[PDB]
Design a protein around this ligand. Structure first.
Ligand SMILES: *[C@@H]1O[C@H](CO)[C@@H](O[C@@H]2O[C@H](CO)[C@@H](O[C@@H]3O[C@H](CO)[C@@H](O)[C@H](O)[C@@H]3O)[C@H](O)[C@H]2NC(C)=O)[C@H](O)[C@H]1NC(C)=O
Ligand SMILES: *[C@@H]1O[C@H](CO)[C@@H](O)[C@H](O)[C@H]1NC(C)=O
Ligand SMILES: C[C@@H]1O[C@H](O)[C@@H](O)[C@H](O)[C@@H]1O
Length: 276
């Protein structure tokens, strides 16, 4: 037994030195916290005895691998947290059976590429958090065209250096309703002209990166955009290089959260007026 938070519903099994999933818990359990347990590896049907699971926290469980069908029976699960696991191998069917998964948190799991991240069948997914990883390319794999319900994608604190036009290809031909994209805290110093064309976005975070400039009209092909973060970037406010951005930011002051500032002087980019 773990700490019973709610009878036959919620149990807290964090740090009890478990190496296997507990079998002495109600089959009606909805919430399970198994964080901080040397689980090391997950085999097929690891949670067969918990068909009612909706939220599963497995962060910091020293997990290295996950075999096909590890969560095969959990068809009611909507939140899976894998934060802090030194994952090194991820089978193709590792997330098989998660037909209701809405939130996947894979922060700090040594993720190096989205291509090999076997999540292309989680059509019900609404939130994907892969912040604090080793991803160095923002090129979205073709399977993203099946994630029609995605409204939040967090790629902050990774190794992304730039955003090419091709990177959002998949979203061009299979647009989402209200997508919020977080790309802050990346060593990003380049955005290719027309990389956000035909793209629909509700939020775009690009603060605390390495940007000095952006292509002209980069944000013209957008209207659903509501919030944007550009602060904490070494903006080059010489003219006419800063012309488009300074004007855009001034004609959209409500959208910008925080304040993009000019390197050196510290003057708001939206306050600069370039000569004609
Ligand atoms: C948490 O789950 C346990 C077990 O599932 C609940 O206790 C169990 O309650 C059932 C009644 O729904 C008991 O089963 C049988 O009930 C009939 C009533 O008609 C009675 O005639 C039988 O003799 C028998 O009791 C079962 O014995 C009982 N088991 C336990 C745990 O003692 C418990 O109520 C649940 N707690 C919550 C969240 O309310
Ligand atoms: C998308 O999902 C369908 C249905 O399972 C599958 O056949 C297809 O290969 C997947 N990839 C594509 C085409 O985006
Ligand atoms: C089905 C559940 O577990 C078993 C018994 O304790 C009761 O029938 C309860 O309702």
């Amino acid at each position: 037994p773990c700490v019973e938070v709610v009878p036959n519903i919620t149990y807290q099994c964090m740090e009890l030195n478990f190496y296997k999933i507990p079998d002495n818990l109600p089959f009606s359990t909805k919430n399970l916290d198994l964080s901080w347990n040397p689980l090391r590896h997950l085999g097929s049907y690891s949670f067969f005895s918990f068909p009612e699971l909706q939220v599963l926290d497995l962060s910091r469980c020293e997990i290295q691998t996950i075999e096909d069908g590890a969560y095969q029976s959990l068809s009611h699960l909507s939140t899976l947290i894998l934060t802090g696991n030194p994952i090194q191998s991820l089978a193709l069917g590792a997330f098989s059976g998660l037909s209701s998964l809405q939130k996947l948190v894979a922060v700090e799991t040594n993720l190096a590429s989205l291509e090999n991240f076997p999540i292309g069948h989680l059509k019900t997914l609404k939130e994907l958090n892969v912040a604090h990883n080793l991803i160095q390319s923002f090129k979205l794999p073709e399977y993203f065209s099946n994630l029609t319900n995605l409204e939040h994608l967090d790629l902050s604190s990774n190794k992304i250096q730039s955003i090419y036009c091709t990177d959002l290809r998949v979203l061009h031909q299979m647009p989402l309703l209200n997508l919020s994209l977080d790309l802050s805290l990346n060593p990003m110093n380049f955005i290719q002209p027309g990389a956000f064309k035909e793209i629909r976005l509700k939020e775009l975070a690009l603060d605390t990166n390495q940007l000095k400039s952006v292509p002209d009209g980069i944000f013209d092909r957008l209207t659903s955009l509501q919030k944007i973060w550009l602060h904490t970037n070494p903006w080059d406010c010489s003219c006419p290089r800063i012309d488009y951005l300074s004007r855009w930011l001034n004609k959209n002051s409500q959208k910008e959260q925080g304040s993009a500032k000019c390197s050196g002087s510290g003057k708001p980019v939206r306050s600069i007026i370039c000569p004609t």
